[PDB]
């Protein structure tokens, strides 16, 4: 008469807050005989162990959902990848909390993964919206040629297809490159005067230094960069006038855990109302079957709709209707100049400074 809700976390404070939120969620949701019992574990390196131990513990506990928070800080390469296969074998829903890699949306391998933060392709969508604002028709895009770079390029191309416009150039450089001089010279020689970059922090710093050496970042240019490109020493190497974007409450994690727990509880309560309900198997060993109502509960979770702002998911199994902040680098001090509405780009009273001087809009052609 109780539903087990697995969780994975690192901080004892994290797990205490999670337990407190779950306990408080059982106050104003009826007086029936159904409740929820939590079960959380710690992290482990040597991802073979990180997968085997999690599988054993959560399957033996027979939990309904497996939450995954941010990966361990010292191991930035750590990811929920070994978790999403173990919990995707039995179609048990997973709720990522902080990871923003765009490879997850490909649901031919990562079968049963969700989250509540929009990945970096929505930044490409915001870039297209921005290009639809200031009367600019030609933009040069530089990508890391990795999976994220290809995803961003495809998203931008699809966005530009509807507008019937075209991209003058799409630069492509490998991650961790050393000599991008030929690519930068090719970009400079062309008549297109809008440059967009999307790569790691090291690559962003390298290309900023190369552009500074080639003296391309003077007056009359247009700069547009995302989030990872202005992190770390890439900020220390960043040129003046750049335009960057970042989320709101990216890793605050408090409202994150509260909202995730509330959504899971409401989905479970709505699911148990109807008949035709099964339970997770004892898939520790010997259970070659799958969950009978796996896809059914996945659809039920994906069809969620909330007012407490709104938390609505799309066919991509992600979160939308998110806010954003628009930042323009000035005196090597990031300054907020406007907030990106759910779809509008209404700015603030701040006056922007373009590379060089003055606020005059630079064109995109070399006429």
């Amino acid at each position: 008469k109780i539903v087990n809700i697995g969780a994975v976390l690192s901080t004892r404070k994290h797990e205490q807050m999670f337990r407190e939120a779950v306990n408080q969620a059982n106050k104003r949701h009826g007086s029936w005989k159904i409740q929820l019992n939590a079960t959380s574990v710690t992290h482990k390196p040597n991802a073979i162990q990180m997968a085997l131990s999690v599988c054993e513990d959560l399957i033996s506990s027979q939990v309904y959902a497996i939450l995954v928070s941010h990966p361990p800080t010292p191991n930035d390469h750590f990811t929920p990848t070994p978790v999403s296969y173990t919990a995707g074998f039995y179609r048990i829903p997973v709720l990522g909390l902080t990871t923003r890699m765009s490879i997850y949306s490909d649901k031919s391998i990562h079968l049963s993964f969700l989250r509540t933060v929009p990945p970096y392709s929505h930044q490409s969508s915001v870039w297209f919206e921005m290009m639809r604002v200031y009367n600019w028709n030609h933009i040069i895009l530089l990508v890391s040629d990795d999976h994220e770079g290809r995803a961003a390029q495809k998203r931008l191309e699809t966005l530009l297809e509807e507008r019937e416009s075209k991209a003058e150039k799409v630069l492509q450089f490998d991650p961790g490159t050393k000599n991008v001089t030929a690519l930068l010279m090719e970009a400079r020689d062309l008549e297109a005067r809008v440059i967009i970059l999307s790569a790691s922090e090291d690559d962003a710093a390298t290309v900023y230094r190369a552009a500074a050496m080639l003296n391309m970042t003077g007056s009359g240019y247009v700069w547009l960069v995302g989030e990872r490109e202005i992190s770390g020493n890439a900020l220390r190497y960043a040129p003046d006038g750049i335009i960057g974007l970042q989320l709101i409450n990216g890793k605050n994690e408090s409202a994150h855990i509260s909202d995730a727990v509330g959504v899971v509880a409401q989905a479970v309560h709505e699911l148990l109302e109807k008949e035709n309900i099964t339970d997770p198997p004892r898939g520790c060993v010997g259970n070659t079957n799958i969950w009978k109502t796996g896809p059914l509960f996945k659809r039920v979770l994906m069809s969620s709709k909330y007012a407490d702002g709104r938390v609505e998911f799309n066919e991509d199994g992600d979160r939308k209707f998110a806010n954003y902040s628009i930042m323009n680098l000035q005196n090597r001090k990031l300054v907020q100049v406007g907030i990106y509405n759910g779809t509008h780009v209404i700015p603030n009273d701040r006056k922007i400074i373009w590379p060089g001087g003055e606020t005059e809009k630079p064109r995109g052609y070399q006429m």
Partner: antibody, heavy 118, light 114 residues
């Protein structure tokens, strides 16, 4: 808005100490976390700043390899570690955050207090 | 690094009489791109609350009294007070805010008394 710091602590020569600076009362995630110094009988000394959102870090030339920094958004608690501390390191430490006025940085506006060391 | 000193370093004068404080910098701190200079005065007497007294050398803070006034441009700056009161007995500093000078710097200090 107000900030809280760690208590008094004395360290033996060659030891390391990790201090903290609690934050509350303003938008934390879009701010810089500066660190200062004040040895009595001598002028102050800027050390470093940390950008909250993206962990942007900068080091002074003197303290290029003498310390390290970290942050945590969930608890709004700053982190800073001193390395190779000695008797010459005995001086008060502060955590301060710069502010924006009229759309331009006007200096230091948020201040802490205490946190002696010897 | 812009290292500036304030002259003189101390004074023991009768209360209620105007005094002059000046802080002279090495380079001109003007910035015509934004048409704003990077000047700021500070104070700390009890409880070690270093608070920005007057910034920009032309605009006072909201709570700073009328009698306080700052002035100066380029490298020379002038801090003029109409009347001296015992509540103003403290140590002052001058600090720039221009992003060119890495790191920042603080004034020499003036432990005034009476």
């Amino acid at each position: 808005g107000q900030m809280q710091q760690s208590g008094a602590e004395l360290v033996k020569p060659g030891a390391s100490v990790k201090l903290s600076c609690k934050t509350s009362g303003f938008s934390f995630s879009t701010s810089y976390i500066n660190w200062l110094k004040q040895k009595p009988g001598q002028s102050l000394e800027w050390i470093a700043w940390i950008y909250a959102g993206t962990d942007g870090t900068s080091y002074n030339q003197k303290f290029t390899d003498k310390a390290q920094l970290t942050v945590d958004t969930s608890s709004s608690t700053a982190y800073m570690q001193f390395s190779s501390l000695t008797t010459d390191d005995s001086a008060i430490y502060y955590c301060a955050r710069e502010g924006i006025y009229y759309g331009n940085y006007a200096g230091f506006t948020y201040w802490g207090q205490g946190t002696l060391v010897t | 690094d812009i290292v500036m000193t304030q002259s003189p370093s101390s004074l023991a004068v009768t209360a209620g009489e105007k005094v002059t404080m000046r802080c002279k910098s090495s380079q001109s701190l003007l910035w015509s791109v934004n048409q704003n200079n990077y000047l700021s005065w500070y104070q700390q007497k009890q409880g070690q609350p270093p608070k920005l007294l007057i910034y920009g050398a032309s605009i006072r803070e909201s709570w700073v009294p009328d009698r306080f006034t700052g002035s100066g441009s380029g490298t020379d700056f002038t801090l003029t007070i109409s009347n001296v009161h015992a509540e103003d007995l403290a140590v002052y500093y001058c600090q720039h805010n221009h992003g060119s000078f890495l790191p920042y710097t603080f004034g020499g200090g003036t432990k005034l008394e009476i």
